[PDB]
Swiss-Prot record, chain A:
Binds 1 heme c group covalently per subunit. PSII binds multiple chlorophylls, carotenoids and specific lipids. The lineage of its organism: Bacteria, Bacillati, Cyanobacteriota, Cyanophyceae, Thermostichales. PSII is composed of 1 copy each of membrane proteins PsbA, PsbB, PsbC, PsbD, PsbE, PsbF, PsbH, PsbI, PsbJ, PsbK, PsbL, PsbM, PsbT, PsbX, PsbY, PsbZ, Psb30/Ycf12, peripheral proteins PsbO, CyanoQ (PsbQ), PsbU, PsbV and a large number of cofactors. It forms dimeric complexes. GO terms for biological process: photosynthesis, light reaction; respiratory electron transport chain. It comes from Thermostichus vulcanus (Synechococcus vulcanus). GO terms for molecular function: electron transfer activity; heme binding; iron ion binding. Heme c binds at C37, C40, H41, H92. Belongs to the cytochrome c family. PsbV subfamily. It is found in: Cellular thylakoid membrane. Its cofactor is heme c. Keywords: Electron transport, Heme, Iron, Membrane, Metal-binding, Photosynthesis, Photosystem II, Signal, Thylakoid, Transport. This is Photosystem II extrinsic protein V. It is a peripheral membrane protein. One of its GO terms (cellular component) is plasma membrane-derived thylakoid membrane.
Swiss-Prot record, chain B:
NCBIfam families: PRK02655.1. Disulfide bonds: none annotated. Keywords: Membrane, Photosynthesis, Photosystem II, Reaction center, Thylakoid, Transmembrane, Transmembrane helix. It comes from Thermostichus vulcanus. InterPro entries: PSII_PsbI, PSII_PsbI_sf. This is Photosystem II reaction center protein I.
Curated annotation (Swiss-Prot), chain C:
InterPro entries: PSII_cyt_b559_asu (IPR006217), PSII_cyt_b559_asu_sf (IPR037025), PSII_cyt_b559_CS (IPR006216), PSII_cyt_b559_N (IPR013081), PSII_cytb559_asu_lum (IPR013082). Belongs to the PsbE/PsbF family. The chain crosses the membrane at residues 18-32. Keywords: Electron transport, Heme, Iron, Membrane, Metal-binding, Photosynthesis, Photosystem II, Thylakoid, Transmembrane, Transmembrane helix, Transport. Heme binds at H20. Residues 33-81 are lumenal. GO terms for molecular function: electron transfer activity; heme binding; iron ion binding. GO terms for biological process: photosynthetic electron transport chain. GO terms for cellular component: photosystem II reaction center; plasma membrane-derived thylakoid membrane. Pfam families: Cytochrom_B559, Cytochrom_B559a. This is Cytochrome b559 subunit alpha. It is a single-pass membrane protein.
Swiss-Prot record, chain F:
Residues 51-113, 156-196, 285-342 are lumenal. GO terms for molecular function: chlorophyll binding; electron transporter, transferring electrons within the cyclic electron transport pathway of photosynthesis activity; metal ion binding; oxygen evolving activity. Residues 1-29, 131-141, 218-267 are cytoplasmic. It comes from Thermostichus vulcanus. Its main location: membrane. This is Photosystem II D2 protein. The keyword RNA-binding does not apply. Its EC number is 1.10.3.9. Fe cation binds at H204, H258. The chain crosses the membrane at residues 30-50, 114-130, 142-155, 197-217, 268-284. Belongs to the reaction center PufL/M/PsbA/D family. Chlorophyll a PD2 binds at H187. It is found in: Cellular thylakoid membrane. The gene is psbD. One of its GO terms (biological process) is photosynthetic electron transport in photosystem II.
Length: 137, 38, 81, 451, 334, 342
């Protein structure tokens, strides 16, 4: 098994358009995700709220859908609750709240794309492990 | 309980005083060889 | 003592070093190439990082028969495209 | 080449430094050179930390232990402990490093080139271990120096920028201490507190006025004591109690240092005042409390009435009483109810956690802080995989508090061992039997049978 | 001779059948207190709410235990590191429910055993011996401090201290493995080398000395009668022992100096057990064993399991089951 | 009567740097092969086809996680000879099927026999009593019971210990969860023997070192000893008084002291060996029946015994599927035992 271009091809937007990441983009995504996100989202779960995970199936049912690059990038800019009803930037790291979550200050658009790509590709590799929790360790 | 507390406090103080004053009472000289250790 | 030349005597002699400053690095390089040419993988039948699994498979190629184990392994290896 | 082999000195190479016991010049060299090593490490480590430092990551995610020390003193940081200027760190590094050269020079000079003994060279710098007067005078000098050191911290707090105050209103900030606690009742009151849970002895100090005032008392005490010891010589009762020899003094200091090492371990583990969590990460108790807080906030947002939620045991799921009645967080964290931190205290009322404040007054900054500390609990593996022992690889993290506490427990322990070793040996050597039992005079043979 | 002098002479007397001494002055009452309370508690103490969740655990013989399962149960998690002497309880019944006996026993015991170390030094000094036996004793003593005091201090509760019983010990060990992966910690490994090695060298030294006993007896008598207490001559031939062991390995892997040898026999297990103790004491502050969970990954990014991951599965089994009613929130942070 | 046998005997018993002897003919190849096998395996050989595990440096494992793993459970108790019906002479397949495990274990066993024979042979040549060999009976019993007998009572070599640091740790945890081995009185006697042994080692060493006669002027006391001196180097009389007064009782007989130092750890290991022989048949000290009856009927009754059982049940459920791949255990999340929250 290898990290092929097929694996690295993910939904760009809701309309079904895809983008193909490079191995470098994917690895950069992993590194950045470890840097800014993993303290809470290690392995695709959420430590401070285990009800919501980062499985693609979950992201697809968020409002608005987050199972694609644009959705995730927007989320990292202006995060909402799962139903889209509330803006939670004040308690969730984002570009909108980079003043209170300083690690978000040195993240660029390219970086948000990388992180998104990592979040979408990982489940294609790890299957149930991603979002699965200790049961699948 | 208060009586128990005072009893223990006194007992402990007594024994600790024995320990301290004990080692203060020319202890280095209590060895079998050289006695002049001051 | 039991007669052999004492180790201190030997390992501080120039001749010992003349021989071993060659023989030692040469073995090290032979060991290096044994891995680096990928020959070790083929000799011991150890998977390279891309040969543990078929691209879409997630099942372990576990040996399950005693007398057909060899053929099982050969088959699992075939199935790696 | 005096005393530089086993034949002349009586000591094998593996106890080689014992050959230095009566060579005051060379011993001075060893000490100055060693001090050189200490200062060197301070400088170099500081520069290393600075070069690996990213201002927008919390310090505690970066393996830092010296920078947090500098930031606590008030240099380089602003409100909330944000780093505003790394230059002071740089200075502190560079200066320490430069100084280490001077000390090094001194060390080496005294060690190999200078006078091997000092007694003939100078009656002032020269000393006999058995001269009680000289020893107490040297001791006096060093006490005076320590006193000045303690006063320096006070000078920083009161006249040179202040200190970082995690407890300062509006989030942490650097603050000038204008009125240090001078009331001896308070100051030594700390000294008389139980070391057990909820009391915590001197580890319990939780405001900077007490720290500063305590250091004023310490400075005056040290200076006065140094003068006392310069001007006097040990009394008869003291004279009869101690062994008067170099190894004996060493052993006394070894006990001292062990004790201090253990205290330091507890200080860094529990205290979040002089070890601010902004810099060092949350304490263990702090992170546990923070998890409880996090889930109370989450479930309350979902509609739970947290005050009345009964957990599976029958104890409150979120809130319960402490053995003396105070309203506290539930779950295992019941053990950590003695925790006090600036992020939690606004929810506190006279009876402990206030349900109304919990319901109405929880700010987003508090939720943030609880989430952060909960996810930076001081648990992690030896190869720095953060989290519980069963966690997968991903997060490169071990807390500064763990590193510091563990290191210092190990050191304190081995220093206690060193104390036993050297005190026992000092006793045996003063009495005359450290090399073994004299056959022609074996004491036990001159003693009656036990039975 | 005045009474104080007379007393001091009796206390420090090398003629007492058991040496008392100044350390013994603290040691005797404290160990007696610990011992008496331990015995009564082990037999007759009612169940104790160890984990603070009103789920009392039965530790005594009268309440359904045998020698193997019985324990003096650690004090309540609600108490934490708080000091809980008898006089702090409203009644003995409260005190017993909450695990007071555990605290009384371990504080008295630790004080007493420390004074035991001291007393070893003390008697060595009265007898004109060299002073370092107590240093060897500091290794098992530090270990007792680790599991009864240091670890509770780090975890924030005496409820996490080692229970005073056999099965309780096993429990403590299993939970320790779940929370710190102690098996993967280098200090526990050095500890194991310390004790396995200690046992090895014990048997070794014993067997070599025994193998080289000089013939002083007939076959119908115990060879032990060939040594007489106090005799000046050595009872075995260290040159023959050395000749044999030297041939077994090679000459320079064998000790011919008895002082050097015996020092080695002291040093190996003491040093190893020191590390073992330091392990427990440092895992007390949650610096845990090596974590190689998911360390080996394939080209695609699949997790390739190693033996470390199997260990992780077992540890997870321990973690999820331990203290099954005590956790309300998803992370076990203490 | 000096024929080739006696000339060969002559050569074998030369006083050289490394003694050979007749026993060396067995010992040396077997010890070398078992060691070389382990080094080869841990460096180059996988456990993918037998366990679904990486186990070599080549695959990225470190010294703690490398192993020569047991063969697949499907091999049973096959000798797994290279020229056998499974590998059929194919070295590579043979490595993949776990042949190195039986290679190492068997050469290891014969190697151990060789070493004990060496102890006997040298003892007989030098003229000492053979107590060292006798003491070595204990490691042999342990090895034979744990690496040979135990798997032979089980389904296959798979359940024997695997030769690696972490692999052995897993063996420990498996024995706790499945066998409740800490509850076994034979294990307990083993522990007593080992810890008591370490204790005797330390206390004897420290005692000797702290009752030395001053036989020299130096502060380093090691020099003041000569291997051929007749006198004891330390005072047994002072040692005896010290211990009598500290601990109540003391040794007075040196020969007995050293015999006891042989006896304690040797006996401990032999006891633990008997218990493992029991575990070969799953004849465990798992439960106390009275406890289970009381606990079954009375849900307020709890001891450390029942607590430890809950832990065992956890270990079994969470580790079984990955640890025993050939069983194809599928345990849905819902059947997994878990306490609250965790
Ligand atoms: C000469 C010898 C004299 C000996 C005489 C014997 C007298 C008693 C000896 C010490 C016994 C200590 C037992 C309690 C240990 C403990 O729980 O210590 C913990 C305390 C700290 O207490 C904690 O202190 C905390 C204070 O912090 C508070 O204040 C903070 C302010 O920032 C924060 O707000 C924080 O959240 C808040 O809780 C809380 O009160 C906690 O409830 C409380 O438990 O340490 C302290 O007091 C200071 C450090 C104590 C040192 C412990 C030494 C252990 C030595 C091991 C030796 C091994 C040797 C082996 C030999 C071979
Ligand atoms: C902090 C560590 C430390 C320090 C400061 C010392 C210091 C000393 N040792 Mg000790 N020692 C140590 C650790 C240390 N030791 C350790 C770990 C061991 C175990 C191996 C020993 C074993 C030992 C023995 C057996 C002996 C000593 C002796 C000495 C003394 C004389 C050494 C000498 O003359 O050699 C001369 C060596 C040289 C000339 C070679 C170079 C030495 C220089 C100083 C190194 C400088 C390098 C540095 C980068 C230069 C910077 C210059 C720059 C600042 C401008 C000296 C005071 C001797 C003694 O007691 O004398 C009475 C002695 O016999 N030591
Ligand atoms: C541990 C501290 C220490 C002590 C007690 C000594 C003691 C001695 N030194 Mg040494 N030395 C040291 C460190 C020390 N030195 C250092 C760090 C260096 C490098 C600069 C030297 C370089 C040196 C040389 C080249 C010589 C000596 C000499 C001497 C002897 C004569 C000193 C004298 O009469 O000066 C009189 C006192 C003064 C001149 C006061 C000077 C005050 C200083 C310079 C200002 C700063 C003081 C302040 C407290 C510094 C704080 C430092 C702190 C942060 C660590 C005396 C035995 C001489 C000797 O051995 O004779 C044969 C000699 O030739 N020293
Ligand atoms: C570096 C620190 C230091 C050292 C090593 C010394 C050393 C000495 N002092 Mg000095 N002293 C110092 C600082 C120091 N002093 C300072 C700063 C002051 C001003 C406060 C003094 C004021 C002073 C006076 C007035 C006297 C001494 C005396 C002495 C000598 C006797 C020591 C003794 O018997 O203690 C033994 C310890 C005790 C007697 C303490 C009481 C026993 C308790 C129960 C021990 C337990 C304490 C406990 C473990 C602590 C826990 C914390 C606690 C505070 C709650 C000894 C040479 C004596 C002397 O001979 O002077 C010439 C003397 O009369 N000192
Ligand atoms: C109190 C001392 C102390 C503390 C608390 C720390 C803590 C830390 N260091 Mg620092 N450091 C120190 C001293 C200390 N260090 C010293 C003396 C040096 C010079 C060698 C350094 C040079 C240094 C570098 C270059 C780096 C660190 C880093 C770190 C961080 C990661 C540590 C790690 O991963 O280690 C791994 C753990 C070990 C290696 C365990 C060591 C086990 C030892 C050998 C046991 C010894 C026991 C005892 C002393 C022996 C007794 C023997 C007996 C017979 C008597 C951590 C915050 C890293 C970092 O993140 O920087 C930002 C980093 O890159 N440190
Ligand atoms: C400030 C503290 C201090 C000072 C000044 C001394 C001074 C002395 N000690 Mg003491 N000692 C101390 C603390 C101290 N000790 C402590 C804390 C312990 C407990 C472990 C001891 C235990 C001890 C023993 C058992 C003995 C001494 C002895 C001595 C004398 C000779 C020492 C020597 O030459 O060592 C030479 C130095 C070495 C041989 C090297 C030691 C190497 C260590 C183990 C390295 C540790 C690893 C490192 C921390 C990390 C790894 C680094 C690596 C990867 C490169 C000398 C007076 C001897 C004596 O009795 O003289 C009368 C002696 O027998 N000491
Ligand atoms: C010298 C001591 C020694 C001993 C005791 C062993 C023992 C063993 N080896 Mg090892 N081995 C050794 C040295 C040794 N080896 C050396 C030097 C090498 C490198 C060449 C090897 C390389 C090796 C490999 C590759 C393998 C073994 C294996 C084995 C095991 C099975 C051996 C077997 O069944 O042979 C049986 C052979 C005999 C019993 C010879 C006896 C001859 C009798 C007494 C005389 C009759 C012979 C007759 C005249 C011949 C007629 C032939 C005709 C009918 C065709 C056994 C544990 C196997 C294994 O470990 O599987 C797990 C295996 O695969 N060995
Ligand atoms: C681990 C053991 C540590 C012992 C102390 C460290 C040695 C260091 C020491 O204490 O003394 C140092 C010593 C110095 O030797 P010399 O140079 O004086 O040699 C003199 C010889 O000529 C004797 O005739 O080194 C050795 O003797 C050999 C060292 C190991 C050589 C390994 C040879 C391997 C041979 C094959 C294995 C045989 C096993 C047989 C049994 C199964
Ligand atoms: C005696 C003795 C000894 C010891 C010694 C010692 C301990 C010494 C030390 C010494 C020392 C302690 C030294 C030091 C030095 C230092 C230096 C020399 C420094 C320099 C620095 C610099 C040059 C800097 C630079 C810089 C800057 C300025 C900026 C930033 C960056 C950098 C870093 C680049 C021994 C053991 C051998 C033994 C024998 C005897
Ligand atoms: C199996 C087999 C065989 C055999 C083979 C062999 C015999 C091999 C050998 C091999 C070898 C023989 C190898 C070796 C190796 C070694 C190594 C790999 C080492 C390493 C080391 C190190 C790394 C070190 C470390 C250390 C320590 C340990 C301590 C001290 C310090 C140090 C750190 C140095 C045969 C062919 C018969 C057949 C087939 C099967
Ligand atoms: C709470 C802790 C209290 C600590 C108090 C510390 C105070 C220090 C000074 C106390 C007075 C010292 O008192 C000390 O003990 C006894 C009291 O009879 C004296 O008397 C002693 O004389 C010699 C000393 O060689 C002994 O053999 C004898 O047994 C004893 O009578 C000591 O000579 C004296 O040195
Ligand atoms: C295996 C042992 C077999 C011994 S064989 C023995 O060897 C002698 C020479 O050493 C001969 O003289 C004799 O005839 C022969 O039978
Ligand atoms: Cl909880």
């Amino acid at each position: 098994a290898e990290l092929t271009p097929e694996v690295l091809t993910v939904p760009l937007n809701s309309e079904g358009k895809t983008i193909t990441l490079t191995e470098k983009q994917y690895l950069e995504g992993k590194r950045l995700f470890q840097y800014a996100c993993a303290s809470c989202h290690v392995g695709g779960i959420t430590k401070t709220n285990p009800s919501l995970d980062l499985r693609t199936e979950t992201l697809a049912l968020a409002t608005p859908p987050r199972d694609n690059i644009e959705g995730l990038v927007d989320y990292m800019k202006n995060p909402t609750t799962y139903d889209g009803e509330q803006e939670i930037a004040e308690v969730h790291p984002s570009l909108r709240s980079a003043d209170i979550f300083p690690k978000m200050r040195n993240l660029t658009e390219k970086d948000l794309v990388a992180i998104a790509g990592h979040i979408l590709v990982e489940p294609k590799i790890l299957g149930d492990k991603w979002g699965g929790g200790k049961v699948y360790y | 309980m208060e009586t128990l507390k005072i009893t223990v406090y006194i007992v402990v103080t007594f024994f600790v005083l024995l320990f301290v004053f004990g080692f203060l009472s020319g202890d280095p000289a209590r060895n079998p060889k050289r006695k002049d250790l001051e | 003592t039991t007669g052999e030349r004492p180790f201190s005597d030997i390992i501080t002699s120039v001749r010992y070093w003349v021989i071993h400053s060659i023989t030692i690095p040469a073995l090290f390089i032979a060991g290096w190439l044994f891995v680096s040419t990928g020959l070790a993988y083929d000799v011991f039948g150890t998977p390279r990082p891309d040969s543990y699994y078929a691209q879409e498979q997630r099942s372990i190629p576990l040996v399950t028969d005693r007398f057909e184990a060899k053929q099982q392994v050969e088959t699992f290896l075939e199935q790696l495209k | 080449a005096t005393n530089r082999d086993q034949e002349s000195s009586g000591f094998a190479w593996w106890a080689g430094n014992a050959r230095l016991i009566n060579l005051s010049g060379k011993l001075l060299g060893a000490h100055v050179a060693h001090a050189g090593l200490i200062v060197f490490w301070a400088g170099a480590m500081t520069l290393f930390e600075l070069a690996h430092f990213i201002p927008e990551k919390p310090m505690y995610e970066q393996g830092l232990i010296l920078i947090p020390h500098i930031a606590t003193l008030g240099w380089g940081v602003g409100p909330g402990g944000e780093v505003v200027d790394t230059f002071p760190f740089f200075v502190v590094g560079v200066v320490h490093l430069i100084s280490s050269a001077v000390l090094g020079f001194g060390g080496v000079y005294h060690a190999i080139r200078g006078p091997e003994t000092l007694e003939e060279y100078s009656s002032f710098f020269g000393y006999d271990w058995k001269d009680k007067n000289k020893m107490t005078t040297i001791l006096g000098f060093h006490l005076i120096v320590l006193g000045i050191g303690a006063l320096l911290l006070v000078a920083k707090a009161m006249f040179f920028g202040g200190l970082y105050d995690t407890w300062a209103p509006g989030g942490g900030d650097v603050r000038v201490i204008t009125n240090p606690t001078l009331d001896p009742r308070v100051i030594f009151g700390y000294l008389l507190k139980s070391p057990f849970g909820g009391e915590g002895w001197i580890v319990s100090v939780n405001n900077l006025e007490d720290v500063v005032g305590g250091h004023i008392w310490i400075g005056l005490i040290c200076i006065a004591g140094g003068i006392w010891h310069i001007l006097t010589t040990p009394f008869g009762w003291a004279r009869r109690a101690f062994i008067w020899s170099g190894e004996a003094y060493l052993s006394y200091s070894l006990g001292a240092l062990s004790m201090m090492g253990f205290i330091a371990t507890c200080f860094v583990w529990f205290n979040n005042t002089v070890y601010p969590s902004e810099f060092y990460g949350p304490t263990g108790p702090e992170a546990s409390q923070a998890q409880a807080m996090t889930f109370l906030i989450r479930d309350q947002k979902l509609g739970a009435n947290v005050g009345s939620a009964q957990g599976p045991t029958g104890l409150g799921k979120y809130l319960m009483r402490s053995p003396t009645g105070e309203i506290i967080f539930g779950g295992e964290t019941m053990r950590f109810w003695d925790f006090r931190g600036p992020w939690l205290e606004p929810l506190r009322g006279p009876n402990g956690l206030d349900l109304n404040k919990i319901k109405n007054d929880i700010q987003p900054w508090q939720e943030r802080r609880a989430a952060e500390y909960m996810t930076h609990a001081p648990l992690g593996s030896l190869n720095s995989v953060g989290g519980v022992a069963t966690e997968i690889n991903s997060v490169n993290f071990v807390s500064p508090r763990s590193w510091l506490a563990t290191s210092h427990f190990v050191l304190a322990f081995f220093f206690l061992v060193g104390h036993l070793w050297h005190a026992g040996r000092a006793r045996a050597a003063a009495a005359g039997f450290e090399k073994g039992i004299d056959r022609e005079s074996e004491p036990v043979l001159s003693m009656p049978s036990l039975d | 001779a005045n009474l104080w002098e007379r007393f001091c002479n009796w206390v420090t007397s090398t003629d007492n059948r058991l040496y008392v001494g100044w350390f013994g002055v603290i040691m005797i009452p404290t160990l007696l207190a610990a011992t008496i309370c331990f015995v009564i508690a082990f037999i007759a103490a009612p169940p104790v709410d160890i984990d603070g969740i009103r789920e009392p655990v039965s530790g005594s013989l009268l309440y359904g235990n045998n020698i193997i399962t019985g324990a003096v149960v650690p004090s309540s998690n609600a108490i934490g590191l708080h000091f809980y002497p008898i006089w702090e309880a409203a009644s003995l019944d409260e005190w017993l429910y909450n695990g007071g006996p555990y605290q009384l026993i371990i504080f008295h015991f630790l004080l007493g055993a420390s004074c035991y170390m001291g007393r070893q030094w003390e008697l060595s000094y009265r007898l004109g011996m060299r002073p370092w036996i107590c240093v060897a004793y500091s290794a098992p003593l530090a270990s007792a401090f680790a599991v009864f005091l240091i670890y509770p201090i780090g975890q924030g509760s005496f409820s996490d201290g080692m229970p005073l019983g056999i099965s309780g010990t096993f429990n403590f060990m299993i939970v320790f493995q779940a929370e710190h992966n102690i098996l993967m910690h280098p200090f526990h490994q050095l500890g194991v080398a310390g004790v396995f090695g200690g046992a090895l060298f014990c048997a070794m030294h014993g067997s070599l000395v025994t193998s080289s006993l000089i013939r002083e007896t007939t076959e119908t008598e115990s060879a032990n009668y060939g040594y007489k207490f106090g005799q000046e001559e050595e009872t075995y031939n260290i040159v023959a022992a050395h000749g044999y062991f030297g041939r077994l390995i090679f000459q320079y892997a064998s000790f011919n100096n008895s002082r050097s040898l015996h020092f080695f026999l002291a040093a190996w297990p003491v040093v190893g057990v020191w590390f073992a103790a330091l392990g427990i004491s440092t895992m007390a502050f949650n610096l845990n064993g090596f974590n190689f969970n998911h360390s080996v990954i394939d080209a695609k990014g699949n997790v390739i399991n190693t033996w470390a991951d199997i260990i992780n599965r077992a540890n997870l089994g321990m973690e999820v089951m331990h203290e099954r009613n005590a956790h309300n929130f998803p992370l076990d942070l203490a | 009567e000096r024929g080739w046998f006696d000339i060969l005997d002559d050569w074998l018993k030369r006083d050289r740097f490394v003694f050979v002897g007749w026993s060396g003919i067995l010992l040396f190849p077997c010890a070398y092969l078992a060691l070389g096998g382990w080094l080869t395996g841990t460096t180059f050989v996988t456990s993918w086809y037998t366990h679904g595990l990486a186990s070599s440096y080549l695959e990225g494992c470190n010294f703690l996680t490398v192993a020569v793993s047991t063969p697949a459970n499907s091999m049973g108790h096959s000798l797994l000879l290279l020229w056998g019906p499974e590998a059929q002479g194919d070295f590579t397949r043979w490595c993949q099927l776990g042949g190195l495990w039986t290679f190492i274990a068997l050469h290891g066993a014969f190697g151990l026999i060789g070493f004990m024979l060496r102890q006997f042979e040298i003892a007989r040549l030098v003229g000492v009593r053979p107590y060292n060999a006798i003491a070595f009976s204990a490691p042999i019993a342990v090895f034979v019971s744990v690496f040979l007998i135990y798997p032979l009572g089980q389904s296959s070599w798979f359940f024997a210990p695997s030769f690696g640091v972490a692999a052995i740790f897993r063996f420990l945890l498996f024995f706790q969860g499945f066998h409740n081995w800490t509850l076994n009185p034979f294990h307990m006697m083993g522990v007593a023997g080992v810890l008591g042994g370490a204790l005797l080692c330390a206390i004897h060493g420290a005692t000797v070192e702290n009752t030395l006669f001053q036989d020299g002027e130096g502060a380093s006391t090691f020099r003041a000893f000569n291997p051929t001196q007749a006198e004891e180097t330390y005072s047994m009389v002072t040692a005896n008084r010290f211990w009598s007064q500290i601990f109540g009782i003391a040794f007075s007989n040196k020969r007995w002291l050293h015999f006891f130092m042989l006896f304690v750890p040797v006996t401990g290991l032999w006891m633990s060996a008997i218990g493992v022989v029991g575990l070969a048949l799953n004849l465990r000290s798992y439960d106390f029946i009275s406890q289970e009856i009381r606990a079954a009927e009375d849900p307020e009754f709890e001891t450390f015994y029942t607590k430890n059982l809950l832990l065992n049940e956890g270990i079994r459920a969470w580790m079984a599927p990955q640890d025993q791949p050939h069983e194809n255990f599928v345990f849905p999340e819902e059947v997994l035992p878990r306490g609250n929250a965790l």
